[PDB]
Each structure stands twice: as structure tokens, then as C-alpha cells.
Amino acid sequence: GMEKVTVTLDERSYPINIAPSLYQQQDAFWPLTAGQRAMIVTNETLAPLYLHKIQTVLEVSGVKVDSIILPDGEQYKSLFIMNDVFTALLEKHHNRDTTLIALGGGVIGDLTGFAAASYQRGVRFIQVPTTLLSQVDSSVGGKTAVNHPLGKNMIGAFYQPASVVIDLDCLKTLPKRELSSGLAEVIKYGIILDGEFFSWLEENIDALMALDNQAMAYCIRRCCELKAQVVAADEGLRALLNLGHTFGHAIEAEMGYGVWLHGEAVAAGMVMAAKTAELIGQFTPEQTDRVIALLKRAELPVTGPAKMQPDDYLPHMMRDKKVMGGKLHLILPTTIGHSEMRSDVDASTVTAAISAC
Amino acid sequence: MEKVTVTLDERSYPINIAPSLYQQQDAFWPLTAGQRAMIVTNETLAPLYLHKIQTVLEVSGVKVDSIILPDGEQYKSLFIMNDVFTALLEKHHNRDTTLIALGGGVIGDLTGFAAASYQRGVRFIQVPTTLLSQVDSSVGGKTAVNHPLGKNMIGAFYQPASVVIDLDCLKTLPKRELSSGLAEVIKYGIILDGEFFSWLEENIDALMALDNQAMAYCIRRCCELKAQVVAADEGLRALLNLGHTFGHAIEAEMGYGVWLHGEAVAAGMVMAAKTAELIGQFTPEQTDRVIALLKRAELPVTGPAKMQPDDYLPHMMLHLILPTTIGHSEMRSDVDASTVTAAI
């Protein structure tokens, strides 16, 4: 009934529990125990939906609960917004034994994680992700960060949670465009690391799009296992997680944020990366049709913006524009389920990949 | 020239102590030709030692930027640290850069937390210019900035790649700060090293005169001693707050800048010694060697008459560090409130 993944990285270990109505289970927010305190960090969108339920379930178990409601937005993933959490913790005399609870998506997840890393140089930290993206991505790897006006995720810390609480019910309220955005990263795991999971996704995508409890539970479980594996082997293998992200960054940068969701840009970037793998001679068009066909059924774009031409991509795709830079490093699939980093690929290869679509 | 190698958290870094160290060849190792460096300092230290290190560094093939912050504890803030990030990004410093903390404990703490947080961690070299930061901030990995509702409440544990202690920089340090640092030097002798305390009884006059050879061993020994007790807490380490509970009370009641931290701790150490005899843990004769050595360092031995004992306890709220001998110490859980006022 309950899926469970144990993650052991950077010499610590935490569980990821996945089940519908998990917010109500007995010891759902372990290792929080009766008598301890907790500070829930959430945003203005999620607060009316889930804060009160989470607060009462914790108080039922003997936890003393405070909360802080931040504004909703990537533009609020700032050092100055995170300061407000420190104020809330201090006004309520939260000491080093408190637990910070990230009730929200990846934005709340990153900001609350860095707050838990920094408050008194480190307090306990429990993740409650409410987007599919953050459930299969933010739950593993320890990366926390806020943005700087001159660069995204340039201020943060490596910091692992004590546990991850994934109640599938919270997906019922998630905008359907966000759910497909998350599914782009789900499909990415199939292409770079597990061909059988990709095949499983070919046969259950419709159930996931319908929010089937049993299919969604296994999906999140397997993606967490796959990211945990590729992080445990690395700590440059973790770079394989940027499949479709170089092409996707160009789309996100050139179109402006919020216009294309991150997952939407990654979906078309994975197609373009599959097309770059064919051009070099490592991928078949039939393999590319399986990627295109599965993203189409996730209601994800498979071609880039009409507004953009191949020369709009390359400025964003380069590591830098320095004289000795200007290099294109890509992650390319070798099979469905296998991938490689490929350094210095021709601009002509890239252009052709983009033009083919 | 003294050297301490400290190994904590399965990592290792050196502390080099020598006069004219800023001009030495690889004094700012592991920085090498082709790499970048960002120096963080305050307005006081910039005219004195910036540009000198910059010239030693640029001659050695490293490309150098710097940022000069105002001098003061009030600038150990999250908003000031953001400006460090702004400077690094404006100059396109990537994850391979190195932050250089050229300053006292304030610059050290802020730059350390900036290096811990910038791209989730970049290299970080300490150049402490106060005696306090040489014997305290150079070991233990604590970095932080302040919050208005609490000092050092936003930070990270983050070890430096090296600590570069040029003894020449002490020549410009105000004598009140040098005496303030010596209170913490004396702290190590009382809580963990009796032989060092005796060494201090015979060399205090050399340290006050900035004798290179005495200062080099002094700084070396204090670093070794804290490195030991930091490695032990992996359960002691509370002993380094001897006289700091009393010291906070004086600092809190009188205000910043009026009493320097070491002066507050020095007079607080006496009060802890007199309470240690009151409960029966110290002899009255031993307390005179603590008082006599601090007086010869030009440190206060009496808490100001401007506060009554009843002013002290409100901040102290019972969980104290008290000396057992000169060279050994203990934390004692529940001590009477009446005992502390009787010490005054």
C-alpha cells in the first residue's frame, strides 16, 4: 500500500515514503516525535489547501507547530525571503532541536532546505513535496539554494533531509500543466538510466496522467531510486541528469521564465538531444519516435518554439562565450536507458538537430 | 616560523605562523598561477595590507578582485554577505574561485559563510589580523553572520584550505585588541594546559612586546589545543566557554565597543574562579595566578562597579564552565544562583 525508498548519501540516510492519504498515517512525519517542535514553511497557494491538515496531524502526535507563509513564486526564491524564516524561528524561540518542514514544491523545498542548513549552522529538515517535479527530483541529491539577481541557485548548501513525505492526494490540486512538466523528468530517468522503466512508462503513462494511485506510487518510487543511484556513484556521473537541459535552457532563457515550464523545455530538449545522437551515429530514428510518442501522450511539447531559430539556441547552449570557451557539452542517449556526456560537438550538428524538428 | 596541521572531518589544512609571511613564495597556497581570488577585507585593513597581498598574488599568476566592507560587528549581516555574492557574480567568479578573509574575526566569519554558501561551496583561505582570530577563528570551522534576534544564528560549518598568519600584521593592531586576544590565549592555559600557563607566566612580557619567537609559539600552541578539543567533540568543547557566560553578561549590560570581548571574558574568568572556590572546586591560592597573569596582560580583573550582581543573572538564564586546576576544567550542571552574587 505504501511505497518506500531509503536514500543513503554523504554518509547519512533518510526514507522516502509514498502513499495516498499519507498525511494521516500513524508516524507519517518521522523522525518528528511527541514533545518536539516543528516549523512549517509553505506558500500562499498551498497554505489554504494543506497547512491546516498538516498542522493538526502534527499536533495530534504531540508536536508543537509554528508556520510561516511565503509568497508564491520563483521570483521570491531569494536570500531576503529566507531571512523571514529566520525571523519566524527566532521570534518563536526555536532552538537547534527544531525541525523545518518544507510544505510546497521545489521552490519551497530549495529555500526551506537552505534555511535548515543555515539556521544555527544546521537543524533537522523534513521535505513534504507537493509537485510531481519536486517529488521525483528535489527529494534526492541534497542541493539547496536560493537565487541571486545575477544567477539562479548561486547561493545554497548541500543538505540532506531527515525524511520525505509524499502524500499522493496533494497531486489532485496540482495544475495539470505542472503534472506534465514533472512527467518530463520522469521520462528523462527512463531514457538515461532504465530502459525497462521507459517501457513501463509507455504502458502506464495514461494511468499516471489520470493520477492512478498505484501507478503514481511506483513511478515516484522508481525515479527516486534512479536519481539516488546516479548520485551515489558520482559522489561526473550526476551530469547525466541534464539530458535535454542544454537545449531546454536556451528555450527557457530566450522565451522568458514562466512562459515555458521547466519540464516543457526539457521535453523538447530531450527530443533535440535524441536527434543529436542520431546525427553522430549512435541513435536510431525508431528510438527517437519512442521518445516523441511518449512525450506527446504526456501532453508535452516535442518541437521548439517557432519564434526561435537554431542561431537563437547556440548563444545560450555554450558554456561561455570566451575565446577558449564556446564549447557545446551535451548529454546524449546511447540507447533508451543508456547515456553519455559528449564534449565539444559541432555547431553544425546542433543546428541540424534543431532544424530537423 | 611555526606550523600547525589540523585534521578534522576527514579533511586537513595548515596554519602557518611567521613574520614577513605575506611576501613568502607560496604563502597563500593552494592558490596557484591561473586561478582567481576574491579578497574580503574592511576599511581599516585595506590601506595597510591590501595591495601588498594583491601584489604578491598577481606576481604569482593569480587574477585578483577584492571588496572592502565597513569596519564593524554590525556589518556581519546577511545583507552585507549578499553584496559579497554580488561582487563575485559581477566579476564572473565561478566555483573554482577562492575567497580570502583578510581581517579579524568579523571579516573571517562573514567571508567563511560566503565561501560556504557561494555555489554551495568554494575554496576559502584565512588571513587573520587580530590575535583573537589567530588563536580562535583559525580552528573549529564555525562561520556565521548575525541576526537582530541573535548573534551567529545564520552560518555554516566550513573548514578553510589554509590559514596564513603573518606576525607583522600584529604591529598595527591596537594594544587593547592585542590584550583582548591574550585573554583567550590565557583561556587555553586555565582549562587544558598547565604547562602552557606556566610558559605564559614567563613569556607574557615577550608577547606584550610582540616578540616574533614568543608570539609564533603562542599562536601555534593555542591552535593545537583547540584542534585537540574540536577533535574530541566528534564530548567536551563546552569548556571553551569558560568565563563567556560571565563575559556575555558584562558585554550585554554595557554594550558593544565599550568592553572588548576578551576584556569581558578576562574579568569573567576571575568571577568563575572565585565561584569555583565558593562551591569548593578551586583553591583560593590558584585564583591569584589567574588574576596576576591577566593584570600583566593589561586586562581587567574586576567587573565594572556600574552593574550590581543582580544585573548579571538576567542574562545568565546554571550550566557553567569552572576550572578544576590550572590546565584542567569541567562543566558543572546546576550551581546555585546565590554563589555567583557572593563572588561579586
Ligand SMILES: NC(=O)c1ccc[n+]([C@@H]2O[C@H](COP(=O)([O-])OP(=O)(O)OC[C@H]3O[C@@H](n4cnc5c(N)ncnc54)[C@H](O)[C@@H]3O)[C@@H](O)[C@H]2O)c1
Ligand atoms: N536538486 C534540487 O534541489 C532541485 C531539483 C529540481 C528543481 N529544483 C528547484 O525547484 C524549483 C521548481 O520546482 P516546482 O516544479 O515545484 O515549481 P514551484 O515550487 O514554483 O510550484 C509550481 C506551482 O504550482 C503550485 N503548487 C505546488 N504544489 C501544488 C499543489 N499540490 N496543488 C496546487 N498547486 C500547487 C505552486 O504554489 C506553484 O505556484 C526550481 O527553483 C528548481 O531550481 C531543485
Ligand SMILES: NC(=O)c1ccc[n+]([C@@H]2O[C@H](COP(=O)([O-])OP(=O)(O)OC[C@H]3O[C@@H](n4cnc5c(N)ncnc54)[C@H](O)[C@@H]3O)[C@@H](O)[C@H]2O)c1
Ligand atoms: N569560532 C569562530 O569562528 C569565532 C571565534 C571567535 C570570534 N568570532 C567572532 O569574531 C568577531 C570578533 O573578532 P575580533 O576580535 O577579531 O574583532 P574584529 O574582527 O572587529 O577586529 C578588531 C578591530 O581591530 C581592527 N583590526 C583587525 N586587525 C587589524 C590590524 N592588523 N591592524 C589594525 N587594525 C586591525 C579591526 O578592523 C577591528 O576594528 C565576533 O563576531 C566573534 O563572534 C568567531
Ligand SMILES: O=C(CCc1ccc(O)c(O)c1)O[C@@H]1C[C@@](O)(C(=O)O)C[C@@H](O)[C@@H]1O
Ligand atoms: O539546474 C540544473 C541545470 C540547468 C542547466 C542549465 C544549462 C545547461 O546547459 C544545462 O546542461 C543544465 O538541473 C537541475 C539540477 C539537477 O541537475 C540535479 O539535481 O543534479 C537535476 C535537474 O533536473 C534540475 O533541473
Ligand SMILES: O=C(CCc1ccc(O)c(O)c1)O[C@@H]1C[C@@](O)(C(=O)O)C[C@@H](O)[C@@H]1O
Ligand atoms: O559558543 C560560543 C559563543 C560564546 C558564548 C557567548 C555567550 C555565552 O553565554 C556563552 O556561554 C558563550 O563560543 C564560540 C565558539 C567556540 O566554542 C567554538 O569554536 O567551538 C569557541 C569559542 O572561543 C567562541 O567564543
Ligand SMILES: [Mg+2]
Ligand atoms: Mg530538470
Ligand SMILES: [Mg+2]
Ligand atoms: Mg570567545
